Amino acid sequence: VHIDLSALNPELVQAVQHVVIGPSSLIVHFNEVIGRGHFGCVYHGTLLDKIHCAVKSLNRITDIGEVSQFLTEGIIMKDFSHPNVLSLLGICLRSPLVVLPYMKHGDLRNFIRNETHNPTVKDLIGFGLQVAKGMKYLASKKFVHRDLAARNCMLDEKFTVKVADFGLARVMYDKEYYSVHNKTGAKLPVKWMALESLQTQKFTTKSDVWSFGVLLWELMTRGAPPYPDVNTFDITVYLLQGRRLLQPEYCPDPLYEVMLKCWHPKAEMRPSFSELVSRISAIFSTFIG
Ligand SMILES: C[C@@H](c1cccc(-c2cnc[nH]2)c1)n1cc(-c2cc(F)cc(F)c2)c(=O)[nH]c1=O
């Protein structure tokens, strides 16, 4: 796969040079798969400042407009610095690669579903609070995630949760994968979407708050798939009728109250990420477990 750099706006090509990592500074281990995805796979990699990293290839990119958006996103993300947000180490254009820090304990969904790890309810509430802190930071930068889910959060060697994306939620938002037609597989993005996002394809920080509620539900169920008996074509009407994900067995009542507030049918009535951090920190700090 070859990209015509001359088909891109030259101003954008120069503006992204601080994010660019040259091919000679990076070795990709194509036989060491960290995660396989619809828009590209994640592999183990080695970066030269010797750093162990994760390298994400972009597989289904077909037009120069998607490459322009990829560069525009690289400029935005390069500036982010928060302990609960995955850093962007850099990008490669010569097929496009995203270079991320290596996360020893992988994605949050597989971690909480893991039999050996067995996190306690308190640990799971702690992971939820860390996600809320990363989202409070992203909301402060006016950055809309669009696909916040446990499968998109990663854990480092200290069990620090980092908000991230294994898909391309902000580049490929118009693709079939992010619509109700993606009806097969575990990663069904439509089951994390706010009611207004399902109806009008509008995504805001308030629709990320809805997804955060679904993510808290995934943490409390240790990675159960949401709405198992509701088809992707029926989720909109199910939510419009006022039906919601039920309270998990180990979920404390004040945390389910939080989830119901995240799933408010009126986006403007949902709590902010700043309110979510205060509320979850108070539940966590007095928690005995
Ligand atoms: C830095 C990280 C990250 C951290 C927190 C939130 C998000 C996010 C929210 N909604 C979409 N993404 C992404 N990250 C970045 C890219 C990436 C994508 C690009 F298109 C371009 C580019 F330079 C980097 C990626 O593929 N995966 C990933 O984890």
Side-chain angles (χ1 to χ4, degrees), residues 179-186 188-201 203-226:
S179 79
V180 302
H181 303 85
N182 181 13
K183 51 193 66 189
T184 330
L188 295 168
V190 157
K191 295 191 184 185
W192 282 256
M193 288 173 61
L195 195 49
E196 70 277 3
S197 300
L198 287 172
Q199 299 175 302
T200 70
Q201 289 70 56
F203 296 75
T204 69
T205 288
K206 287 308 203 66
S207 63
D208 281 344
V209 169
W210 178 294
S211 305
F212 176 72
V214 181
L215 186 151
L216 283 183
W217 185 92
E218 294 184 86
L219 283 170
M220 295 295 104
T221 61
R222 283 178 179 90

mmCIF file of all heavy atoms in Angstrom, residues 179-226, unseen atoms left out:
data_model
loop_
_atom_site.group_PDB
_atom_site.id
_atom_site.type_symbol
_atom_site.label_atom_id
_atom_site.label_comp_id
_atom_site.label_asym_id
_atom_site.label_seq_id
_atom_site.Cartn_x
_atom_site.Cartn_y
_atom_site.Cartn_z
ATOM 1 N N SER A 179 -22.528 1.591 12.439
ATOM 2 C CA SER A 179 -23.968 1.685 12.221
ATOM 3 C C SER A 179 -24.663 0.369 12.623
ATOM 4 O O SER A 179 -23.995 -0.638 12.887
ATOM 5 C CB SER A 179 -24.242 2.002 10.750
ATOM 6 O OG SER A 179 -24.122 0.842 9.938
ATOM 7 N N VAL A 180 -26.001 0.370 12.638
ATOM 8 C CA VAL A 180 -26.811 -0.791 12.998
ATOM 9 C C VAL A 180 -26.611 -2.016 12.075
ATOM 10 O O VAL A 180 -26.984 -3.131 12.446
ATOM 11 C CB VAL A 180 -28.293 -0.393 13.090
ATOM 12 C CG1 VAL A 180 -28.490 0.733 14.107
ATOM 13 C CG2 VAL A 180 -28.823 0.000 11.718
ATOM 14 N N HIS A 181 -26.019 -1.819 10.889
ATOM 15 C CA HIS A 181 -25.760 -2.927 9.965
ATOM 16 C C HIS A 181 -24.660 -3.876 10.471
ATOM 17 O O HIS A 181 -24.634 -5.045 10.081
ATOM 18 C CB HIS A 181 -25.485 -2.410 8.550
ATOM 19 C CG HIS A 181 -26.614 -1.571 8.052
ATOM 20 N ND1 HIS A 181 -26.696 -0.222 8.360
ATOM 21 C CD2 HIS A 181 -27.730 -1.937 7.380
ATOM 22 C CE1 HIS A 181 -27.832 0.199 7.824
ATOM 23 N NE2 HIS A 181 -28.488 -0.797 7.222
ATOM 24 N N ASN A 182 -23.789 -3.397 11.373
ATOM 25 C CA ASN A 182 -22.801 -4.264 11.999
ATOM 26 C C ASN A 182 -23.604 -4.995 13.079
ATOM 27 O O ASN A 182 -23.770 -4.486 14.184
ATOM 28 C CB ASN A 182 -21.663 -3.449 12.616
ATOM 29 C CG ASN A 182 -20.596 -4.297 13.258
ATOM 30 O OD1 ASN A 182 -20.530 -5.522 13.079
ATOM 31 N ND2 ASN A 182 -19.727 -3.666 14.015
ATOM 32 N N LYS A 183 -24.163 -6.153 12.720
ATOM 33 C CA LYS A 183 -25.003 -6.949 13.617
ATOM 34 C C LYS A 183 -24.340 -8.236 14.125
ATOM 35 O O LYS A 183 -24.939 -8.941 14.936
ATOM 36 C CB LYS A 183 -26.336 -7.280 12.925
ATOM 37 C CG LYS A 183 -26.166 -7.877 11.532
ATOM 38 C CD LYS A 183 -27.474 -7.899 10.743
ATOM 39 C CE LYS A 183 -27.975 -6.509 10.431
ATOM 40 N NZ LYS A 183 -29.343 -6.531 9.848
ATOM 41 N N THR A 184 -23.114 -8.544 13.668
ATOM 42 C CA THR A 184 -22.415 -9.769 14.068
ATOM 43 C C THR A 184 -21.091 -9.449 14.778
ATOM 44 O O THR A 184 -20.452 -8.441 14.475
ATOM 45 C CB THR A 184 -22.198 -10.720 12.857
ATOM 46 O OG1 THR A 184 -23.234 -10.564 11.877
ATOM 47 C CG2 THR A 184 -22.104 -12.185 13.274
ATOM 48 N N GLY A 185 -20.693 -10.313 15.705
ATOM 49 C CA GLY A 185 -19.462 -10.148 16.469
ATOM 50 C C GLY A 185 -19.701 -9.623 17.870
ATOM 51 O O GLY A 185 -20.818 -9.210 18.187
ATOM 52 N N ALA A 186 -18.662 -9.634 18.729
ATOM 53 C CA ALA A 186 -18.797 -9.115 20.097
ATOM 54 C C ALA A 186 -18.726 -7.585 20.092
ATOM 55 O O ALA A 186 -19.478 -6.919 20.816
ATOM 56 C CB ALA A 186 -17.700 -9.681 20.992
ATOM 57 N N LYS A 187 -17.817 -7.025 19.277
ATOM 58 C CA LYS A 187 -17.685 -5.576 19.187
ATOM 59 C C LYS A 187 -18.829 -5.053 18.315
ATOM 60 O O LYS A 187 -18.748 -5.063 17.087
ATOM 61 C CB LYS A 187 -16.317 -5.133 18.622
ATOM 62 C CG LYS A 187 -15.233 -6.208 18.545
ATOM 63 C CD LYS A 187 -14.214 -6.080 19.652
ATOM 64 N N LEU A 188 -19.922 -4.665 18.953
ATOM 65 C CA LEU A 188 -21.077 -4.118 18.259
ATOM 66 C C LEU A 188 -21.165 -2.693 18.785
ATOM 67 O O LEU A 188 -21.796 -2.482 19.810
ATOM 68 C CB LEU A 188 -22.349 -4.897 18.653
ATOM 69 C CG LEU A 188 -22.382 -6.351 18.241
ATOM 70 C CD1 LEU A 188 -23.522 -7.077 18.926
ATOM 71 C CD2 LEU A 188 -22.470 -6.487 16.728
ATOM 72 N N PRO A 189 -20.495 -1.719 18.135
ATOM 73 C CA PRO A 189 -20.473 -0.347 18.673
ATOM 74 C C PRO A 189 -21.825 0.293 18.988
ATOM 75 O O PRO A 189 -21.907 1.115 19.889
ATOM 76 C CB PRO A 189 -19.730 0.443 17.593
ATOM 77 C CG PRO A 189 -18.876 -0.566 16.915
ATOM 78 C CD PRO A 189 -19.682 -1.830 16.906
ATOM 79 N N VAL A 190 -22.865 -0.070 18.242
ATOM 80 C CA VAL A 190 -24.222 0.445 18.419
ATOM 81 C C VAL A 190 -24.777 0.217 19.853
ATOM 82 O O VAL A 190 -25.553 1.037 20.348
ATOM 83 C CB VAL A 190 -25.094 -0.173 17.296
ATOM 84 C CG1 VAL A 190 -26.564 -0.199 17.631
ATOM 85 C CG2 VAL A 190 -24.872 0.572 15.998
ATOM 86 N N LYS A 191 -24.303 -0.826 20.554
ATOM 87 C CA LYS A 191 -24.754 -1.101 21.922
ATOM 88 C C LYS A 191 -24.112 -0.208 22.995
ATOM 89 O O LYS A 191 -24.452 -0.324 24.167
ATOM 90 C CB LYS A 191 -24.597 -2.588 22.257
ATOM 91 C CG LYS A 191 -25.527 -3.433 21.373
ATOM 92 C CD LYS A 191 -25.607 -4.863 21.834
ATOM 93 C CE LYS A 191 -26.449 -5.712 20.914
ATOM 94 N NZ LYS A 191 -26.618 -7.084 21.460
ATOM 95 N N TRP A 192 -23.192 0.677 22.611
ATOM 96 C CA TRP A 192 -22.620 1.687 23.520
ATOM 97 C C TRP A 192 -23.093 3.109 23.146
ATOM 98 O O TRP A 192 -22.735 4.077 23.828
ATOM 99 C CB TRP A 192 -21.077 1.649 23.521
ATOM 100 C CG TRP A 192 -20.502 0.529 24.331
ATOM 101 C CD1 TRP A 192 -19.934 0.610 25.573
ATOM 102 C CD2 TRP A 192 -20.409 -0.845 23.932
ATOM 103 N NE1 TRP A 192 -19.511 -0.637 25.979
ATOM 104 C CE2 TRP A 192 -19.768 -1.543 24.976
ATOM 105 C CE3 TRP A 192 -20.772 -1.548 22.776
ATOM 106 C CZ2 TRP A 192 -19.582 -2.923 24.938
ATOM 107 C CZ3 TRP A 192 -20.536 -2.913 22.717
ATOM 108 C CH2 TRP A 192 -19.963 -3.586 23.792
ATOM 109 N N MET A 193 -23.844 3.253 22.051
ATOM 110 C CA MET A 193 -24.273 4.550 21.582
ATOM 111 C C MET A 193 -25.437 5.134 22.336
ATOM 112 O O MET A 193 -26.416 4.432 22.631
ATOM 113 C CB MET A 193 -24.618 4.484 20.108
ATOM 114 C CG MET A 193 -23.405 4.341 19.251
ATOM 115 S SD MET A 193 -23.823 4.053 17.529
ATOM 116 C CE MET A 193 -24.678 5.442 17.171
ATOM 117 N N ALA A 194 -25.373 6.461 22.562
ATOM 118 C CA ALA A 194 -26.469 7.190 23.182
ATOM 119 C C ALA A 194 -27.676 7.144 22.256
ATOM 120 O O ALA A 194 -27.527 7.014 21.032
ATOM 121 C CB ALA A 194 -26.070 8.648 23.405
ATOM 122 N N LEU A 195 -28.858 7.288 22.828
ATOM 123 C CA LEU A 195 -30.105 7.316 22.079
ATOM 124 C C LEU A 195 -30.098 8.322 20.901
ATOM 125 O O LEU A 195 -30.465 7.945 19.792
ATOM 126 C CB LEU A 195 -31.231 7.646 23.068
ATOM 127 C CG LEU A 195 -32.666 7.405 22.648
ATOM 128 C CD1 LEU A 195 -32.852 6.022 22.058
ATOM 129 C CD2 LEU A 195 -33.602 7.610 23.856
ATOM 130 N N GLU A 196 -29.639 9.570 21.119
ATOM 131 C CA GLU A 196 -29.580 10.562 20.047
ATOM 132 C C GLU A 196 -28.520 10.222 18.987
ATOM 133 O O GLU A 196 -28.691 10.582 17.819
ATOM 134 C CB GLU A 196 -29.388 11.989 20.597
ATOM 135 C CG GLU A 196 -28.017 12.266 21.197
ATOM 136 C CD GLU A 196 -27.797 11.824 22.639
ATOM 137 O OE1 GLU A 196 -28.715 11.218 23.232
ATOM 138 O OE2 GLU A 196 -26.691 12.077 23.173
ATOM 139 N N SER A 197 -27.422 9.545 19.380
ATOM 140 C CA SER A 197 -26.407 9.124 18.418
ATOM 141 C C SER A 197 -26.990 8.040 17.512
ATOM 142 O O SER A 197 -26.709 8.036 16.321
ATOM 143 C CB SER A 197 -25.175 8.582 19.135
ATOM 144 O OG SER A 197 -24.611 9.574 19.971
ATOM 145 N N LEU A 198 -27.806 7.127 18.069
ATOM 146 C CA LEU A 198 -28.469 6.071 17.296
ATOM 147 C C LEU A 198 -29.454 6.669 16.281
ATOM 148 O O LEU A 198 -29.576 6.168 15.169
ATOM 149 C CB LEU A 198 -29.226 5.112 18.232
ATOM 150 C CG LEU A 198 -28.354 4.172 19.064
ATOM 151 C CD1 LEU A 198 -29.171 3.419 20.076
ATOM 152 C CD2 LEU A 198 -27.601 3.204 18.180
ATOM 153 N N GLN A 199 -30.149 7.734 16.661
ATOM 154 C CA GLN A 199 -31.151 8.357 15.804
ATOM 155 C C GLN A 199 -30.630 9.389 14.795
ATOM 156 O O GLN A 199 -31.158 9.454 13.686
ATOM 157 C CB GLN A 199 -32.244 8.991 16.664
ATOM 158 C CG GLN A 199 -32.971 7.977 17.526
ATOM 159 C CD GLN A 199 -33.948 8.647 18.438
ATOM 160 O OE1 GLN A 199 -33.587 9.503 19.250
ATOM 161 N NE2 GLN A 199 -35.214 8.264 18.326
ATOM 162 N N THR A 200 -29.659 10.233 15.176
ATOM 163 C CA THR A 200 -29.191 11.311 14.299
ATOM 164 C C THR A 200 -27.710 11.287 13.961
ATOM 165 O O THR A 200 -27.247 12.208 13.287
ATOM 166 C CB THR A 200 -29.540 12.673 14.913
ATOM 167 O OG1 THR A 200 -28.732 12.884 16.073
ATOM 168 C CG2 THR A 200 -31.004 12.788 15.300
ATOM 169 N N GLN A 201 -26.958 10.273 14.435
ATOM 170 C CA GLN A 201 -25.506 10.151 14.197
ATOM 171 C C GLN A 201 -24.689 11.333 14.752
ATOM 172 O O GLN A 201 -23.574 11.578 14.306
ATOM 173 C CB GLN A 201 -25.173 9.898 12.711
ATOM 174 C CG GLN A 201 -25.564 8.514 12.214
ATOM 175 C CD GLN A 201 -27.065 8.356 12.130
ATOM 176 O OE1 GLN A 201 -27.764 9.136 11.469
ATOM 177 N NE2 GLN A 201 -27.599 7.354 12.816
ATOM 178 N N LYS A 202 -25.248 12.056 15.711
ATOM 179 C CA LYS A 202 -24.611 13.189 16.366
ATOM 180 C C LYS A 202 -23.936 12.667 17.629
ATOM 181 O O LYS A 202 -24.584 12.009 18.441
ATOM 182 C CB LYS A 202 -25.673 14.227 16.767
ATOM 183 N N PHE A 203 -22.637 12.935 17.778
ATOM 184 C CA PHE A 203 -21.867 12.489 18.932
ATOM 185 C C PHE A 203 -21.269 13.714 19.601
ATOM 186 O O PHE A 203 -20.661 14.554 18.947
ATOM 187 C CB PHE A 203 -20.745 11.507 18.522
ATOM 188 C CG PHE A 203 -21.231 10.200 17.936
ATOM 189 C CD1 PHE A 203 -21.722 10.141 16.648
ATOM 190 C CD2 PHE A 203 -21.217 9.039 18.684
ATOM 191 C CE1 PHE A 203 -22.212 8.951 16.130
ATOM 192 C CE2 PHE A 203 -21.666 7.843 18.150
ATOM 193 C CZ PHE A 203 -22.151 7.806 16.873
ATOM 194 N N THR A 204 -21.473 13.824 20.902
ATOM 195 C CA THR A 204 -20.980 14.917 21.725
ATOM 196 C C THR A 204 -20.361 14.296 23.007
ATOM 197 O O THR A 204 -20.462 13.071 23.236
ATOM 198 C CB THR A 204 -22.173 15.872 22.101
ATOM 199 O OG1 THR A 204 -23.049 15.173 23.002
ATOM 200 C CG2 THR A 204 -22.957 16.385 20.886
ATOM 201 N N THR A 205 -19.817 15.142 23.893
ATOM 202 C CA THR A 205 -19.336 14.689 25.188
ATOM 203 C C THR A 205 -20.502 14.059 25.996
ATOM 204 O O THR A 205 -20.301 13.046 26.654
ATOM 205 C CB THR A 205 -18.613 15.829 25.886
ATOM 206 O OG1 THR A 205 -17.361 16.031 25.222
ATOM 207 C CG2 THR A 205 -18.319 15.514 27.337
ATOM 208 N N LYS A 206 -21.741 14.564 25.824
ATOM 209 C CA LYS A 206 -22.902 13.974 26.505
ATOM 210 C C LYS A 206 -23.248 12.573 26.008
ATOM 211 O O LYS A 206 -23.719 11.756 26.794
ATOM 212 C CB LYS A 206 -24.108 14.914 26.459
ATOM 213 C CG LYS A 206 -23.892 16.094 27.415
ATOM 214 C CD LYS A 206 -23.511 15.630 28.892
ATOM 215 C CE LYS A 206 -23.842 16.682 29.925
ATOM 216 N NZ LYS A 206 -25.304 16.901 30.023
ATOM 217 N N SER A 207 -22.987 12.277 24.729
ATOM 218 C CA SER A 207 -23.190 10.906 24.242
ATOM 219 C C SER A 207 -22.040 9.998 24.731
ATOM 220 O O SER A 207 -22.300 8.839 25.047
ATOM 221 C CB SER A 207 -23.450 10.854 22.743
ATOM 222 O OG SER A 207 -22.362 11.326 21.977
ATOM 223 N N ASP A 208 -20.811 10.543 24.948
ATOM 224 C CA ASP A 208 -19.729 9.750 25.558
ATOM 225 C C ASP A 208 -20.105 9.390 27.035
ATOM 226 O O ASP A 208 -19.690 8.345 27.542
ATOM 227 C CB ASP A 208 -18.415 10.519 25.596
ATOM 228 C CG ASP A 208 -17.622 10.585 24.298
ATOM 229 O OD1 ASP A 208 -17.916 9.778 23.363
ATOM 230 O OD2 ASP A 208 -16.700 11.433 24.217
ATOM 231 N N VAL A 209 -20.855 10.267 27.716
ATOM 232 C CA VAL A 209 -21.324 10.011 29.079
ATOM 233 C C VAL A 209 -22.249 8.786 29.083
ATOM 234 O O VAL A 209 -22.106 7.931 29.946
ATOM 235 C CB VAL A 209 -21.985 11.245 29.723
ATOM 236 C CG1 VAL A 209 -22.709 10.869 31.028
ATOM 237 C CG2 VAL A 209 -20.963 12.357 29.944
ATOM 238 N N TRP A 210 -23.137 8.657 28.081
ATOM 239 C CA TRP A 210 -23.974 7.460 27.945
ATOM 240 C C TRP A 210 -23.077 6.192 27.809
ATOM 241 O O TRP A 210 -23.260 5.217 28.545
ATOM 242 C CB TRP A 210 -24.883 7.599 26.721
ATOM 243 C CG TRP A 210 -25.742 6.394 26.491
ATOM 244 C CD1 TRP A 210 -25.326 5.138 26.150
ATOM 245 C CD2 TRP A 210 -27.169 6.341 26.564
ATOM 246 N NE1 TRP A 210 -26.403 4.293 26.069
ATOM 247 C CE2 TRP A 210 -27.553 5.016 26.276
ATOM 248 C CE3 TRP A 210 -28.168 7.296 26.791
ATOM 249 C CZ2 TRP A 210 -28.888 4.606 26.292
ATOM 250 C CZ3 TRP A 210 -29.495 6.898 26.734
ATOM 251 C CH2 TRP A 210 -29.840 5.562 26.551
ATOM 252 N N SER A 211 -22.087 6.230 26.893
ATOM 253 C CA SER A 211 -21.162 5.108 26.706
ATOM 254 C C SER A 211 -20.420 4.771 27.983
ATOM 255 O O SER A 211 -20.238 3.595 28.278
ATOM 256 C CB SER A 211 -20.144 5.428 25.623
ATOM 257 O OG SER A 211 -20.816 5.793 24.434
ATOM 258 N N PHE A 212 -20.047 5.789 28.771
ATOM 259 C CA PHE A 212 -19.373 5.599 30.043
ATOM 260 C C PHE A 212 -20.246 4.797 31.001
ATOM 261 O O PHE A 212 -19.721 3.953 31.726
ATOM 262 C CB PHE A 212 -18.938 6.933 30.671
ATOM 263 C CG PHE A 212 -18.318 6.727 32.025
ATOM 264 C CD1 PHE A 212 -17.059 6.163 32.150
ATOM 265 C CD2 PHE A 212 -19.011 7.060 33.182
ATOM 266 C CE1 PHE A 212 -16.502 5.945 33.406
ATOM 267 C CE2 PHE A 212 -18.457 6.827 34.433
ATOM 268 C CZ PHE A 212 -17.189 6.297 34.533
ATOM 269 N N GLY A 213 -21.558 5.056 31.000
ATOM 270 C CA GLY A 213 -22.498 4.275 31.808
ATOM 271 C C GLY A 213 -22.479 2.797 31.406
ATOM 272 O O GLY A 213 -22.445 1.925 32.272
ATOM 273 N N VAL A 214 -22.475 2.503 30.096
ATOM 274 C CA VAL A 214 -22.403 1.120 29.588
ATOM 275 C C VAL A 214 -21.063 0.507 30.017
ATOM 276 O O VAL A 214 -21.021 -0.640 30.439
ATOM 277 C CB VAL A 214 -22.566 1.031 28.042
ATOM 278 C CG1 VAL A 214 -22.514 -0.433 27.568
ATOM 279 C CG2 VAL A 214 -23.865 1.701 27.581
ATOM 280 N N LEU A 215 -19.973 1.263 29.902
ATOM 281 C CA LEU A 215 -18.651 0.808 30.353
ATOM 282 C C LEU A 215 -18.679 0.475 31.869
ATOM 283 O O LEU A 215 -18.156 -0.570 32.255
ATOM 284 C CB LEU A 215 -17.602 1.876 30.055
ATOM 285 C CG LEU A 215 -16.143 1.490 30.333
ATOM 286 C CD1 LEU A 215 -15.222 2.237 29.402
ATOM 287 C CD2 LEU A 215 -15.745 1.844 31.782
ATOM 288 N N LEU A 216 -19.317 1.314 32.720
ATOM 289 C CA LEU A 216 -19.427 0.989 34.159
ATOM 290 C C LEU A 216 -20.178 -0.344 34.353
ATOM 291 O O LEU A 216 -19.831 -1.123 35.242
ATOM 292 C CB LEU A 216 -20.209 2.056 34.938
ATOM 293 C CG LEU A 216 -19.528 3.350 35.277
ATOM 294 C CD1 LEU A 216 -20.483 4.226 36.118
ATOM 295 C CD2 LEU A 216 -18.230 3.096 36.061
ATOM 296 N N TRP A 217 -21.220 -0.579 33.544
ATOM 297 C CA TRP A 217 -22.011 -1.820 33.589
ATOM 298 C C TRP A 217 -21.136 -3.027 33.189
ATOM 299 O O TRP A 217 -21.211 -4.076 33.822
ATOM 300 C CB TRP A 217 -23.273 -1.705 32.696
ATOM 301 C CG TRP A 217 -24.194 -2.888 32.792
ATOM 302 C CD1 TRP A 217 -25.255 -3.036 33.639
ATOM 303 C CD2 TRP A 217 -24.159 -4.078 31.978
ATOM 304 N NE1 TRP A 217 -25.879 -4.245 33.406
ATOM 305 C CE2 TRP A 217 -25.228 -4.900 32.391
ATOM 306 C CE3 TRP A 217 -23.316 -4.530 30.953
ATOM 307 C CZ2 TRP A 217 -25.463 -6.158 31.832
ATOM 308 C CZ3 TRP A 217 -23.547 -5.782 30.400
ATOM 309 C CH2 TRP A 217 -24.609 -6.579 30.842
ATOM 310 N N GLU A 218 -20.263 -2.862 32.183
ATOM 311 C CA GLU A 218 -19.325 -3.911 31.776
ATOM 312 C C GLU A 218 -18.364 -4.215 32.926
ATOM 313 O O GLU A 218 -18.056 -5.371 33.160
ATOM 314 C CB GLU A 218 -18.470 -3.457 30.577
ATOM 315 C CG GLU A 218 -19.209 -3.238 29.283
ATOM 316 C CD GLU A 218 -18.211 -2.901 28.187
ATOM 317 O OE1 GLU A 218 -17.673 -3.855 27.575
ATOM 318 O OE2 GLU A 218 -17.942 -1.697 27.959
ATOM 319 N N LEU A 219 -17.872 -3.180 33.627
ATOM 320 C CA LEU A 219 -16.973 -3.397 34.755
ATOM 321 C C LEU A 219 -17.681 -4.194 35.875
ATOM 322 O O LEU A 219 -17.123 -5.164 36.385
ATOM 323 C CB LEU A 219 -16.495 -2.052 35.310
ATOM 324 C CG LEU A 219 -15.414 -1.388 34.482
ATOM 325 C CD1 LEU A 219 -15.183 0.023 34.947
ATOM 326 C CD2 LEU A 219 -14.101 -2.165 34.582
ATOM 327 N N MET A 220 -18.927 -3.834 36.198
ATOM 328 C CA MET A 220 -19.670 -4.489 37.274
ATOM 329 C C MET A 220 -20.097 -5.911 36.928
ATOM 330 O O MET A 220 -20.265 -6.715 37.829
ATOM 331 C CB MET A 220 -20.850 -3.622 37.730
ATOM 332 C CG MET A 220 -20.426 -2.328 38.362
ATOM 333 S SD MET A 220 -19.498 -2.525 39.922
ATOM 334 C CE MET A 220 -17.861 -2.189 39.330
ATOM 335 N N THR A 221 -20.223 -6.246 35.634
ATOM 336 C CA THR A 221 -20.548 -7.615 35.225
ATOM 337 C C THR A 221 -19.289 -8.417 34.857
ATOM 338 O O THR A 221 -19.423 -9.540 34.375
ATOM 339 C CB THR A 221 -21.486 -7.609 34.011
ATOM 340 O OG1 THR A 221 -20.837 -6.959 32.910
ATOM 341 C CG2 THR A 221 -22.823 -6.972 34.301
ATOM 342 N N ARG A 222 -18.075 -7.840 35.018
ATOM 343 C CA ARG A 222 -16.808 -8.471 34.650
ATOM 344 C C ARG A 222 -16.763 -8.845 33.185
ATOM 345 O O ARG A 222 -16.288 -9.929 32.824
ATOM 346 C CB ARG A 222 -16.441 -9.655 35.556
ATOM 347 C CG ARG A 222 -15.894 -9.218 36.903
ATOM 348 C CD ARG A 222 -15.585 -10.410 37.795
ATOM 349 N NE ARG A 222 -15.031 -9.991 39.085
ATOM 350 C CZ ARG A 222 -15.765 -9.729 40.168
ATOM 351 N NH1 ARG A 222 -17.089 -9.843 40.125
ATOM 352 N NH2 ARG A 222 -15.182 -9.348 41.296
ATOM 353 N N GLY A 223 -17.250 -7.942 32.346
ATOM 354 C CA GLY A 223 -17.161 -8.112 30.903
ATOM 355 C C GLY A 223 -18.280 -8.832 30.186
ATOM 356 O O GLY A 223 -18.039 -9.375 29.110
ATOM 357 N N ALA A 224 -19.518 -8.819 30.731
ATOM 358 C CA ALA A 224 -20.644 -9.423 30.019
ATOM 359 C C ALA A 224 -21.003 -8.541 28.809
ATOM 360 O O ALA A 224 -20.828 -7.306 28.840
ATOM 361 C CB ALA A 224 -21.863 -9.553 30.941
ATOM 362 N N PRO A 225 -21.466 -9.160 27.713
ATOM 363 C CA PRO A 225 -21.891 -8.352 26.559
ATOM 364 C C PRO A 225 -23.234 -7.685 26.891
ATOM 365 O O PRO A 225 -24.139 -8.314 27.465
ATOM 366 C CB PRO A 225 -22.010 -9.380 25.431
ATOM 367 C CG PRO A 225 -22.327 -10.677 26.132
ATOM 368 C CD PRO A 225 -21.699 -10.610 27.500
ATOM 369 N N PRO A 226 -23.354 -6.371 26.627
ATOM 370 C CA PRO A 226 -24.604 -5.673 26.953
ATOM 371 C C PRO A 226 -25.760 -6.029 26.021
ATOM 372 O O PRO A 226 -25.528 -6.249 24.830
ATOM 373 C CB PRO A 226 -24.208 -4.194 26.849
ATOM 374 C CG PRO A 226 -23.128 -4.175 25.825
ATOM 375 C CD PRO A 226 -22.361 -5.468 26.004
#
